[PDB]
């Protein structure tokens, strides 16, 4: 994946170096567009956004009192 950002200034690459992913069957790195692994955009957006709210809610709590 790193090479997708390293060679981007060229706009012409040996490979796009994007849409590569983990093959959970054979244990190799494969292209997900050619392999067929797609995920919703709204899902990854909502996950990452809600993940911040979860982390902030915990990090914000600096005192606990028991009555």
């Amino acid at each position: 994946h790193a090479a997708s950002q390293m060679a981007k200034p060229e706009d012409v690459k040996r490979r796009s170096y994007r849409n590569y992913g983990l093959d959970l069957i054979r244990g190799k790195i494969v292209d997900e567009i050619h392999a067929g692994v797609l995920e919703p955009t709204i899902s990854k957006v909502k996950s990452l956004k809600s993940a911040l709210e979860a982390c902030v809610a915990i990090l914000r709590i600096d005192t606990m009192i028991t009555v």
Binding site: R60, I61, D62, T63, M64, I65, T66, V67
Partner: protein, 491 residues
């Protein structure tokens, strides 16, 4: 040993202050409170912290009285009156360790407060009762911490104009209990209905027979539940309400059954009397007050002199809202009742939104109570520290040494604001003082800018009452705690 008594009183109160120290600011840290009723709550609201703290320490229960007094006095920044109290007590510990008798200490704090209020009056940014630019300006900036502050621009004239109508220009007092905010589901955040009179949360008769409105309406309050253990008995009860020609009837919510048996409800319909049910105790105190009427607990004690008068009584049902407004009271003993219906999306949203407007109503009252806007971000606390330090240089005696420690304690507010903002504490207060060496109101701790700038330019100003009462009420607490000589049980 009274030194042991005072030691315990100071240590205990410091522990309460060290609990709230983290809560000041929009970036404040949250406190978790596990309650004895079995509910664990998490919030940054300061009065919520001390209210649910359930303080058992007799000395620290005075710190709750400080919070409530600050809320009933100004109604904003009640976190800071506890923090200010804590620093004055921590500085008092240093004074006690220096061997200064508490009486000398307390009277010196009294003289510091007298000078401190004057210092705030000097830096006052002048306001005016007609100045709706600054009134709307500051009020909406006090709403800036709320969930949707972009829709609060339209909530601004709701608070500003509604209070300017209820309050005279030359007036020293405004009653926030006479401004009732009522929520209602449906509409948008900028949509609110401000009524110049009492507003009834229920409508006419529930079953068929509801007249829904009255002209030349006389309003009585009969609160007692009417039901059979029957025809003549249940009917004759409401008949007399017709005898004196009372056209609107308010009935308190009963713990037994619904307001009235349908026999006397449909009879009140046959009497052409608009029937209003499920009125709350506090609603009677609100409703019967503005109307100028006296409530009657029972159904037997109906009289004539307690008849009301209402120009407009009609049911306001907007998209299925179902709330009644009554306007044009014209009662010699009444006051300008103001009631607002808060429209919005979700029941939970409008419930909290109403509370966000209660905060704003306190802001405008603070400006009517005492005219002036003061820099936020703890800027007045740095400025006061410099002036009292300058005056302590010419002051002579142990009174000067205590005045100096007062100035050190004034840093707890700008220090707490900087710590909870994540800026180097010494770096910030150093820069605050350097800037106050040149400017006056040009300074303040800015969360957005991560530095020192003019909160006036950042649109962050606070009523001078908030700062004045914060110092004033704090000196009363310092006296109260330092004057505790022994703790005894009574039985």
């Amino acid at each position: 040993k009274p030194q042991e008594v005072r030691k315990a009183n100071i240590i205990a109160a410091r522990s309460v202050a060290d609990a709230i120290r983290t809560s000041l600011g929009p970036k404040g840290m949250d406190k978790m409170i596990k309650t004895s009723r079995g509910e664990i709550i998490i919030s940054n609201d300061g009065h919520t912290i001390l209210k649910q703290m359930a303080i058992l320490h007799p000395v620290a229960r005075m710190l709750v009285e400080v919070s409530a007094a600050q809320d009933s006095e100004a109604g904003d920044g009640t976190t800071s009156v506890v923090i200010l109290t804590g620093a004055l007590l921590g500085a008092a510990e240093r004074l006690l360790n220096k061997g200064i008798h508490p009486t000398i200490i307390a009277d010196s704090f009294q003289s510091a407060a007298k000078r401190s209020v004057d210092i705030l009056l000097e830096m006052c940014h002048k306001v005016s009762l007609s100045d709706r630019e600054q009134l709307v300006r500051a009020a909406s900036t006090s709403l800036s911490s709320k969930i949707v502050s972009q829709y609060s621009s339209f909530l601004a004239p709701l608070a500003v104009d509604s209070v300017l109508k209820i309050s005279d220009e030359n007036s020293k007092n405004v009653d926030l209990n006479d401004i009732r905010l009522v929520k209602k589901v449906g509409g948008t955040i900028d949509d609110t209905e401000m009524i110049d009179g009492v507003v009834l949360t229920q409508t006419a008769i529930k079953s068929a027979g509801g007249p829904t409105r009255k002209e030349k309406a006389k309003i009585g309050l009969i609160q007692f539940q009417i039901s059979p253990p029957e025809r003549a008995y249940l009917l004759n009860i409401c008949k007399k309400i017709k005898k004196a020609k009372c056209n609107v009837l308010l009935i308190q919510k009963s713990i037994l059954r619904d307001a009235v048996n349908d026999l006397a409800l449909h009879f009140l319909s046959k009497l052409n009397i608009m029937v209003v049910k499920d009125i709350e105790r506090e609603e009677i105190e609100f409703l019967s007050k503005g109307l100028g009427c006296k409530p009657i607990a029972d159904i037997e004690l109906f009289t004539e002199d307690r008849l009301g008068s209402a120009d407009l009584v009609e049911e306001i049902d907007s998209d299925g809202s179902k709330i009644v407004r009554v306007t044009g009271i014209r009662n010699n003993n009444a006051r300008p009742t103001v009631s607002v219906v808060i429209r919005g999306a979700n029941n939970m949203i409008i419930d909290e939104t109403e509370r966000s407007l209660h905060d704003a109503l306190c802001v405008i009252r603070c400006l009517v109570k005492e005219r002036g806007l003061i820099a936020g971000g703890g800027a007045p606390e740095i400025e006061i520290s410099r002036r009292l330090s300058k005056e302590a240089r010419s002051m002579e005696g142990v009174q000067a040494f205590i005045w100096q420690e007062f100035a050190s304690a004034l840093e707890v507010i700008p220090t707490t604001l900087a710590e909870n903002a994540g800026l180097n504490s010494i770096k910030v207060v150093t820069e605050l003082r350097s800037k106050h060496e040149n400017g006056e109101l040009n300074d303040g701790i800015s969360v957005r800018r991560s530095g020192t700038t003019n909160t006036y330019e950042e649109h962050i100003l606070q009523p001078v009452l908030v700062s004045t009462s914060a110092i004033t009420l704090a000196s009363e607490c310092v006296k109260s705690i330092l004057r505790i000589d022994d703790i005894a049980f009574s039985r």
